[PDB]
Amino acid sequence: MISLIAALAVDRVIGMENAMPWNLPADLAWFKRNTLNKPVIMGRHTWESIGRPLPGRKNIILSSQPGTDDRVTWVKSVDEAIAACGDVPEIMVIGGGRVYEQFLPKAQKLYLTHIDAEVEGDTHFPDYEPDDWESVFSEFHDADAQNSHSYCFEILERR
Numbered sequence: 001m002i003s004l005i006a007a008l009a010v011d012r013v014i015g016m017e018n019a020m021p022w023n024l025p026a027d028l029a030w031f032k033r034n035t036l037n038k039p040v041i042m043g044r045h046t047w048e049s050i051g052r053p054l055p056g057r058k059n060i061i062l063s064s065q066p067g068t069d070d071r072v073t074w075v076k077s078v079d080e081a082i083a084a085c086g087d088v089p090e091i092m093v094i095g096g097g098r099v100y101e102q103f104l105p106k107a108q109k110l111y112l113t114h115i116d117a118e119v120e121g122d123t124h125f126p127d128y129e130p131d132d133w134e135s136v137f138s139e140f141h142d143a144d145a146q147n148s149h150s151y152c153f154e155i156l157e158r159r
Ligand SMILES: NC(=O)c1ccc[n+]([C@@H]2O[C@H](COP(=O)([O-])OP(=O)(O)OC[C@H]3O[C@@H](n4cnc5c(N)ncnc54)[C@H](OP(=O)(O)O)[C@@H]3O)[C@@H](O)[C@H]2O)c1
Pocket: 005, 006, 007, 008, 013, 014, 015, 016, 017, 018, 019, 020, 042, 043, 044, 045, 046, 047, 049, 062, 063, 064, 065, 075, 076, 077, 078, 094, 095, 096, 097, 098, 099, 100, 102, 123
């Protein structure tokens, strides 16, 4: 099973200048809980944005060019990325925009954080078709002293 996990600001913005400009510790904690002990697939730009391997997860990087760091696994196609995960229950695709586009048709589950923040960005989450997806979990949180925007955790499963 393939799942996508992402945090979206208004208008599906996910990034600007290879960064995420907001800071929502509660959402990073949600990301860690839902990815720990699973393989994570990311594109090369997202690998450069994170800047280090994510501990406790098999890190698989898509790039058309040879890898430059043996602490992670480098693959050259979507099919190779999936195969490199082995026989696991759930593969987590962690972006970015181009990678989400390619895996969305293959995904059964979406873990989405909707952030009430207006962000100029240059990268968006794919338009998906709402009729294809059932919301099975949602949890709203107001802003607090640690998290400066309100946010909604949602899990959707392909119908
Ligand atoms: N809010 C969120 O949840 C979230 C999550 C993740 C990322 N982001 C943001 O998203 C932005 C990065 O997204 P992006 O769309 O620019 O880049 P990306 O999807 O992270 O990476 C694209 C790169 O991945 C490689 N790639 C993708 N598909 C491939 C394929 N089928 N075969 C081989 N290589 C492939 C290519 O690398 P080569 O050029 O080396 O071939 C391509 O240039 C950043 O702003 C980041 O902060 C946000």
